[PDB]
Write a protein that binds this DNA or RNA. Structure first.
Lengths: 82, 217, 50, 102, 104, 135, 186
RNA sequence: UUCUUAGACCGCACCAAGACGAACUACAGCGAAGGCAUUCUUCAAGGAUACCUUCCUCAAUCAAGAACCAAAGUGUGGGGAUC
């Protein structure tokens, strides 16, 4: 059990992102809608800035932490990785 | 001997404190150009709390309340608040190892000329389900407490006068309002007011004094 | 919510809750079942044991 | 807001003050009374400025739409008043008619 | 000669600290680091059991179930000072390596 | 006698400072202020010997002859404050207490609110002696 | 160990600041002077006095006091007296509260104005005959709750010498109800 | 040995000067080492973590040369409480 050329789920998913056999990212993109307009802006999950709503300006996120955190009352769908 | 020339007097305290007299003292005659009456003033006295005051006084006996003489009248002696304190032995009971400690020294003003310092102390407290033998705080955590301490003790006492103030400290009214704010910043085990002290005093008055003792027994 | 609430304490061990169960003005009526049970919490006033 | 004697942005300054005060509260939630009024008062003073000495709308930049001014722009329009309407309904919506609050 | 302790008689592992503050012995006023010196915490009766009765008797506050004050202090002994007064002792080379946490 | 004009048979408190050290005892008596005294009687005086100043016999033999004055002054009860050698000296007291207290209490004085007031520095400069101590 | 507190409570209510008196009664629970009283009853009276200022008492927080008081030991002939005293204060206060509520209702509503009148007019469909009943529904709730707890057994009674109390309390409770309006319960 | 009826020692109140920052203080933290513990304000720095950011071998180690370095010592001026 647990061949090292063909691991399970468990024996990958834990590990730090460079210590897989793949060395993928760890992040994704999203779409976000504001109450004050009809738009979709496309925003980065670990944004690390304040981003002004596409065509509006009010800030859809705060840059805080190692993962950025959406401004309140703004709805958010996710997107694929593919 | 000396004892022939000795007089007697009786100290009195404000009407904040329930038991008005609490002591009996001694002094010399006013013979000579000395006038011993002079040397009754600028004295100081030490009473326990719960002794000077009723009665009793719960777990309050450790604290020391101390006075001065502002003015002589009669064979009585009239006073005003000077310092409040605590015994040594007490503090070390509430001080334990594997916990943090916090210390703050306030500067406050009454609504009068009185200007004060309120030394404080507090300690962190382990959570009830905690499995860790550290209780230690960060730095930002600590500093907030001492911030949100100084502010409050300068906001309550700013608009409160002298006799109006002391009645809080003696009864431990402040401690309530303090700790119940503090706690969600980081958990506290105790807060106490370790010591209280007077720095700058307003200048002498007859009426403001006598109005704070009311009737004199 | 919880400020206005005090304590652990429902409305109530025992009769009160039964009395409110008893009937509705919507559905379920009214009188339905009678309890003979009552509960009151009492113990000696010291601190672990006498 | 008072600046030093002018009233140009004063207008802008009063605008943001009403919008900021009305939103914040953190309980329970909602606003009442005092805090509700300290936005209403500002809006009335803004409207007075708009009536009177204005129009005329000078220094910095003014418009009206779209870009940033911005309680001013939302008071265009009048989304600002809409936010007072929303919050008043809120206060009401929680407390049931009984005591003098009503 | 050898090494007789892994610690080296200290609470300092290498690659951690360079110097820890000296302190003044309770007894003779010798010095040593904080780590080397042996700490104890006393919790010491003001009066005897005997004595306490003969005071509390007269007293207007004590012996109501209200306890009489105790004296608290900490004491930091030097190594020689310690072993002398018999706070600590030499032990077998199998029971030398033992700990008891801070629990008394 | 020179006692109080206040009351009769109702307690009058003094303050009593019991200084304990390894080389002497003192007993001292004051009113409440500490600006005026009633006694100042020291263990040493009751012995002739440098050796036996601090030993428990000396202490007690002071305390007796203190209350032998204080009664006449009308002091019935007492408040007691226990002290030790210094701030750079030892926190531990001498053997001149557990002597002193146990005399006074059985000499027909009352007692209340015993305290420990002794110098404790936040910090000091140097303790007397040296890096290697007395040896 | 009863004075150093009552005074503390006095400070928390007489200057108004105001949940403090209740906090003080809680602090007050014995030790150390459970049945002297010599003023335990007096302390109890101060706690009872506090009705109705919002929040913090609404006096459904009372109840601990009844349980405490008593509150042994009863190795003396004061058990009956204590029970009677607690009941008496509670009843007296209840009557007073009722009286105040009644007065308020009678007063405003006939008359109006201007605020009551505007509310009635609004939509609001309603008299002030109707509206003033707002006082009454709370008054009823407080009374109902007190009865519901009071008569159950810490209070207690029951002995040859303790149960004869219990009927008196019931009579006081019920006669009072008959005066006014009411009643779901008891 | 030494200090005292020229009132020592002791008690209380207050002022002066210089040094230090107890307990909490730990098989804990930070710094390249030597080293660093009261509080508030302020000035520039450093490490770790987070990133689908940018650049694209710019690195490792090291005679010469250079900077830093406990306590004791030397010089000039200042301070002088404790040891």
């Amino acid at each position: 059990d647990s061949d090292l050329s063909y691991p399970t789920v468990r024996s990958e998913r834990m590990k730090h992102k460079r210590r897989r056999l793949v060395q993928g990212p760890n992040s994704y993109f999203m779409d976000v809608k504001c109450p004050g307009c009809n738009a979709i802006t496309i925003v980065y999950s670990h944004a690390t800035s304040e981003v002004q709503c596409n065509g509006c300006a009010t800030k859809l996120c705060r840059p805080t932490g190692g993962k950025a955190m959406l401004t309140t009352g703004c709805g958010f769908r996710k997107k694929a990785d593919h | 001997e000396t004892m022939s020339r000795k007089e007697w007097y009786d100290v009195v305290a404000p009407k904040n404190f329930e038991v008005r007299q609490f002591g009996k003292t001694i002094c010399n005659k006013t013979q000579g150009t000395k006038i011993a009456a002079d040397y009754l003033r600028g004295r100081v006295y030490e009473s326990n709390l719960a002794d000077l005051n009723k009665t009793q006084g719960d777990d309050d006996a450790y604290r020391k309340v101390k006075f001065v003489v502002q003015e002589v009248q009669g064979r009585n002696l009239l006073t005003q608040f000077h310092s409040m304190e605590m015994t040594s032995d007490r503090v070390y009971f509430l001080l334990r190892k594997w916990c943090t400690t916090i210390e703050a020294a306030v500067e406050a003003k009454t609504a009068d000329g009185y200007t004060l310092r309120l030394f404080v102390i507090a300690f962190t407290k382990k959570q009830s389900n905690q499995l860790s033998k550290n209780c230690y705080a960060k730095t930002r955590l600590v500093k907030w407490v001492r911030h949100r301490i100084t502010n409050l003790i300068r906001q309550r006492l700013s608009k409160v006068n002298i006799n109006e103030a002391v009645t809080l400290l003696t009864r431990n009214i402040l401690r309530d309002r303090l700790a119940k704010r503090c706690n969600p910043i980081v958990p506290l085990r105790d807060l106490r007011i370790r010591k209280v002290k007077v720095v700058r005093t307003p200048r002498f008055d007859a009426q403001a004094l006598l109005n704070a003792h009311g009737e004199i027994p | 919510a919880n400020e206005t609430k005090q304590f652990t304490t429902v409305k109530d061990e025992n009769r009160l809750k039964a009395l409110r169960n008893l009937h509705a003005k919507e559905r379920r009526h009214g009188p339905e079942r009678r309890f003979v049970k009552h509960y009151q919490n009492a113990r000696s006033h010291f601190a672990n044991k006498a | 807001s008072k600046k030093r004697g002018l009233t140009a942005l004063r207008i802008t300054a009063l605008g943001i003050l009403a919008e900021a005060l009305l939103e914040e509260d953190t309980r329970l939630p909602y606003v009442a009374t005092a805090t509700w009024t300290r936005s209403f008062d500002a809006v009335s003073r803004i409207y007075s400025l708009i009536t009177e000495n204005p129009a005329i709308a000078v220094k910095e930049v003014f418009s009206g739409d779209l870009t940033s001014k911005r309680a001013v722009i939302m008071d265009g329009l009048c989304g600002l008043l809409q936010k007072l309407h929303v919050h008043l309904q809120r206060i009401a919506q929680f407390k049931t008619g009984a005591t003098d609050e009503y | 000669m050898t090494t007789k302790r892994r610690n080296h008689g200290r609470a300092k592992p290498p690659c951690s600290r360079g110097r820890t503050r000296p302190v003044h012995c309770f007894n003779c006023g010798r010095l040593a680091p904080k780590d080397k010196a042996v700490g104890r915490f006393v919790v010491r009766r003001m009066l005897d059991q005997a004595s306490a009765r003969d005071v509390a008797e007269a007293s207007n506050v004590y012996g109501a179930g209200f306890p009489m004050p105790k004296l608290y202090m900490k004491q930091r002994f030097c190594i020689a000072c310690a072993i002398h007064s018999r706070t600590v002792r030499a032990r077998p080379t199998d029971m030398r390596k033992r700990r008891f946490t801070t629990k008394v | 006698f020179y006692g109080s004009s206040a009351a009769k048979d109702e307690l009058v408190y003094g303050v009593v400072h019991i200084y304990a050290s390894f080389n002497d005892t003192f007993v001292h008596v004051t009113d409440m202020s500490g600006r005026e005294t009633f006694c100042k009687i020291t263990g040493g005086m009751k012995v002739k010997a440098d050796r036996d100043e601090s030993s428990p016999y000396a202490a007690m033999m002071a305390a007796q002859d203190v209350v032998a004055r204080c009664k006449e002054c009308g002091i019935n009860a007492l408040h007691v404050k226990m002290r030790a050698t210094g701030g750079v000296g030892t926190r531990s007291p001498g053997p001149g207490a557990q002597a002193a207290l146990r005399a006074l209490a059985r000499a027909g004085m009352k007692i209340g609110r015993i305290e420990d007031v002794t110098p404790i520095p936040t910090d000091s400069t140097r303790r007397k002696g040296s890096r290697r101590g007395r040896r | 160990k009863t004075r150093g507190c009552l005074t503390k409570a006095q400070t928390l209510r007489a200057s108004g600041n105001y949940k403090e008196a209740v906090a003080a009664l809680q602090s007050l629970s014995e030790h150390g002077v459970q049945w002297g009283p010599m003023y335990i009853a007096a302390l109890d009276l101060l706690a009872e006095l506090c009705f109705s200022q919002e929040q913090g008492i609404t006096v459904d927080r009372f109840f601990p006091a009844f349980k405490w008081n008593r509150n042994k030991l009863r190795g003396s002939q004061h058990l009956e007296e204590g029970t009677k005293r607690i009941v008496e204060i509670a009843m007296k206060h209840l009557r007073a509260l009722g009286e105040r509520a009644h007065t308020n209702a009678k007063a405003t509503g006939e008359t109006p104005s201007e605020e009551e009148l505007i509310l009635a007019a609004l939509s609001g469909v309603s008299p002030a005959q109707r509206a003033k009943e707002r006082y009454l529904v709370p008054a009823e709730t407080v009374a109902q709750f007190l009865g519901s707890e009071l008569l159950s057994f810490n209070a207690i009674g029951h002995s040859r010498k303790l149960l004869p109390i219990y009927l008196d309390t019931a009579t006081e409770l019920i006669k009072y109800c008959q005066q006014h309006n009411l009643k779901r319960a008891i």
